[PDB]
């Protein structure tokens, strides 16, 4: 059975994280026209706030927002951990990195 | 300079931590079964007739 040699190159300080997105309303038919912007909290002194992040995705018609804090932050980001594996098919080596999962949702204000 | 959607993942790995089963010995009871009530040895009659 096909197998890969596992390596956690991972994050140098653990400060580095990749970014996974999941859309609450399904799959994006055209992810190529989306612009994602990652926002971080300016407060680096508060351990609670220093890991707060917002991911915004803008389309022509709607905006999506995901956050890793508050109601929008969901349980899967903690109870479980997410990683990204980059497999080199030639070497059979899989490099594994920490990942952060954002659940994306639509933007409207009264 | 922004973030763009990349190629779809080709596979998923789900990790869980699991221990294994031991041999079946099925040691039902310390002193097992319903041990039967029984005769005290010898006993002897504790009663006699008159005469």
UniProtKB/Swiss-Prot annotation, chain A:
Post-translational modification: In normal conditions, deacetylated by SIRT7, promoting the association of RNA polymerase I with the rDNA promoter region and coding region. In response to stress, SIRT7 is released from nucleoli leading to hyperacetylation of POLR1E/PAF53 and decreased association of RNA polymerase I with the rDNA promoter region.
Any one of the GO BP annotations: nucleolar large rRNA transcription by RNA polymerase I
Keyword vocabulary terms for this entry: Acetylation, DNA-directed RNA polymerase, Nucleus, Phosphoprotein, Transcription
Assigned GO CC terms: fibrillar center; nucleolus; nucleoplasm; RNA polymerase I complex
Residues bearing the modification Phosphoserine: 30
Paired cysteines (S-S): none
Presence of keyword Transcription: yes
Main location, first listed in the record: nucleus
GO MF annotation list: DNA binding; RNA polymerase I general transcription initiation factor binding
UniProt keyword Disulfide bond, yes or no: no
Subcellular location: Nucleus, Nucleolus
Purpose: Component of RNA polymerase I (Pol I), a DNA-dependent RNA polymerase which synthesizes ribosomal RNA precursors using the four ribonucleoside triphosphates as substrates. Appears to be involved in the formation of the initiation complex at the promoter by mediating the interaction between Pol I and UBTF/UBF.
Family that this chain belongs to: Belongs to the eukaryotic RPA49/POLR1E RNA polymerase subunit family.
SUBUNIT field: Component of the RNA polymerase I (Pol I) complex consisting of 13 subunits: a ten-subunit catalytic core composed of POLR1A/RPA1, POLR1B/RPA2, POLR1C/RPAC1, POLR1D/RPAC2, POLR1H/RPA12, POLR2E/RPABC1, POLR2F/RPABC2, POLR2H/RPABC3, POLR2K/RPABC4 and POLR2L/RPABC5; a mobile stalk subunit POLR1F/RPA43 protruding from the core and additional subunits homologous to general transcription factors POLR1E/RPA49 and POLR1G/RPA34. Forms a heterodimer with POLR1G/RPA34. Interacts with POLR1G. Also binds UBTF/UBF. Interacts with PWP1.
Protein name, UniProt field: DNA-directed RNA polymerase I subunit RPA49
Species per Swiss-Prot/TrEMBL record: Homo sapiens
Encoding gene (name): POLR1E
From Swiss-Prot, chain B:
Subcellular location: Nucleus, Nucleolus; Chromosome
Ranges of compositional bias, category Pro residues: 29-41
Top-level division of the source organism's lineage: Eukaryota
Region of interest (Disordered), residue spans: 18-41
Residues recorded with modification Phosphoserine: 26, 34
Other comments on record: It is in an antisense orientation to and overlaps the gene of the DNA repair enzyme ERCC1. This gene overlap is conserved in mouse, suggesting an important biological function.
Its job: Component of RNA polymerase I (Pol I), a DNA-dependent RNA polymerase which synthesizes ribosomal RNA precursors using the four ribonucleoside triphosphates as substrates. Involved in UBTF-activated transcription, presumably at a step following PIC formation.
Assembly, per entry: Component of the RNA polymerase I (Pol I) complex consisting of 13 subunits: a ten-subunit catalytic core composed of POLR1A/RPA1, POLR1B/RPA2, POLR1C/RPAC1, POLR1D/RPAC2, POLR1H/RPA12, POLR2E/RPABC1, POLR2F/RPABC2, POLR2H/RPABC3, POLR2K/RPABC4 and POLR2L/RPABC5; a mobile stalk subunit POLR1F/RPA43 protruding from the core and additional subunits homologous to general transcription factors POLR1E/RPA49 and POLR1G/RPA34. Forms a heterodimer with POLR1E/RPA49. Part of Pol I pre-initiation complex (PIC), in which Pol I core assembles with RRN3 and promoter-bound UTBF and SL1/TIF-IB complex.
Family: Belongs to the eukaryotic RPA34 RNA polymerase subunit family.
Protein name: DNA-directed RNA polymerase I subunit RPA34
Organism this protein belongs to: Homo sapiens (Human)
Lineage: Eukaryota, Metazoa, Chordata, Craniata, Vertebrata
Residues of the whole record sequence present: 103 to 153 of 510
